[PDB]
Amino acid sequence: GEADCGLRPLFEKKSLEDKTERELLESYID
Amino acid sequence: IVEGSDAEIGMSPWQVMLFRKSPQELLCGASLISDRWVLTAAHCLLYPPWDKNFTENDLLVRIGKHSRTRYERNIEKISMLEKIYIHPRYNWRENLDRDIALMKLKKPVAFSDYIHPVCLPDRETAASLLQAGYKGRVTGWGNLKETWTANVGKGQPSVLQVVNLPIVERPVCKDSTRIRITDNMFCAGYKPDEGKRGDACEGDSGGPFVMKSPFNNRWYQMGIVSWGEGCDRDGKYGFYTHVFRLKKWIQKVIDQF
Amino acid sequence: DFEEIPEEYLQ
Ligand SMILES: C[C@@H]1CCN(C(=O)[C@H](CC(=O)NC[C@@H]2CCCN(C(=N)N)C2)NS(=O)(=O)c2ccc3ccccc3c2)[C@@H](C(=O)O)C1
Ligand SMILES: *[C@@H]1O[C@H](CO)[C@@H](O)[C@H](O)[C@H]1NC(C)=O
Ligand code: NA
Numbered sequence: 001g002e003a004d005c006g007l008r009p010l011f012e013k014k015s016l017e018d019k020t021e022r023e024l025l026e027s028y029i030d
Numbered sequence: 031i032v033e034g035s036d037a038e039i040g041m042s043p044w045q046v047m048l049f050r051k052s053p054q055e056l057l058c059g060a061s062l063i064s065d066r067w068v069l070t071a072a073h074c075l076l077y078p079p080w081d082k083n084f085t086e087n088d089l090l091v092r093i094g095k096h097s098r099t100r101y102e103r104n105i106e107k108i109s110m111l112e113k114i115y116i117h118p119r120y121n122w123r124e125n126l127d128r129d130i131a132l133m134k135l136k137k138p139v140a141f142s143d144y145i146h147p148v149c150l151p152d153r154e155t156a157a158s159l160l161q162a163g164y165k166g167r168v169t170g171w172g173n174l175k176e177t178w179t180a181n182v183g184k185g186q187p188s189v190l191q192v193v194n195l196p197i198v199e200r201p202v203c204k205d206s207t208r209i210r211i212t213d214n215m216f217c218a219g220y221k222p223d224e225g226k227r228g229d230a231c232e233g234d235s236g237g238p239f240v241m242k243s244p245f246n247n248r249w250y251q252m253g254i255v256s257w258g259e260g261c262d263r264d265g266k267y268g269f270y271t272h273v274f275r276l277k278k279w280i281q282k283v284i285d286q287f
Numbered sequence: 288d289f290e291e292i293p294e295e296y297l298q
Contacts, residue, residue, distance in 0.1 A: 005149040008249070024165050027163065027164050
């Protein structure tokens with residue numbers, strides 16, 4: 001299928017979130 | 031990056047550094063989109079008003095990097111270029127319209143924890159995510175201030191920098207500059223009354239403006255750091271190549287070559 | 288201020 005992309009081995013793939021990504025997500029719901 | 035902070039290790043595994051051979055200097059950012067293709071700004075390679083015209087042999091691409099200056103022996107991969115492609119209708123004369131370029135690596139790179147490609151957006155993603163008030167992310171090793179005191183002040187970061195910026199309404203973009211802006215650009219940054227700051231700056235050019243989709247958890251490259259008037263000025267905004275509007279060109283180049 | 292990289296890449 002389609003090559004894997006935009007899923008970071010050290011974050012999404014280990015269910016960890018980076019220090020400021022929540023700021024991006026919250027911007028969607030204002 | 032002005033008013034950003036230090037990236038965490040592996041936070042931007044698609045960030046690429048464009049590196050000049052002689053003299054050794056940082057030229058620009060870029061992003062990894064597959065194992066053999068790198069996406070950057072056209073003006074990183076070709077700008078005749080300052081006699082800039084770089085060739086496949088003038089440049090190295092460095093991938094997987096965290097530090098600006100170190101040779102990160104275990105982690106980074108250094109690649110040579112097979113071929114550069116610049117948008118045929120790239121307008122360097124008046125407004126940097128279609129500021130986009132592709133580069134094909136001589137050999138494919140192995141992915142790892144520190145090297146991984148970003149997604150390009152489809153139509154539904156572009157329409158959902160590219161709206162005024164939504165925030166994307168810019169990364170790079172460019173300057174920390176527009177100007178600083180020589181041999182005293184900061185200047186360049188020692189590690190990759192990151193900043194989150196909101197997309198700004200098209201009419202506010204238009205009013206802020208005398209340059210003729212096209213539909214192949216958007217602008218991002220905080221407004222003077224919002225009390226937060228941040229911008230890209232010299233050396234960040236060609237780097238990715240990325241957004242995360244909350245429904246599939248993936249990162250998408252929506253923009254390329256293109257141009258601005260100074261760095262982090264009040265009433266001023268950075269401008270970004272509109273990646274989706276130019277996807278058909280990317281598609282042509284990758285398919286034929 | 289760049290650390291040097293193998294000279295194969297720079298020759
Ligand atoms: C040809 C380069 C493009 C980017 N750039 C420029 O943007 C120059 C110098 C600069 O402040 N770089 C600083 C930053 C470099 C990328 C990010 N950007 C943001 N603030 N977001 C500005 N500006 S400009 O007002 O002189 C300008 C703006 C638009 C223009 C369109 C066509 C032709 C010339 C223009 C010149 C210069 C740079 O090398 O940094 C030169
Ligand atoms: C820049 O250099 C290339 C390769 O050396 C040459 O073929 C091309 O004509 C030049 N283009 C411009 C706009 O100077
Ligand atoms: Na600004």
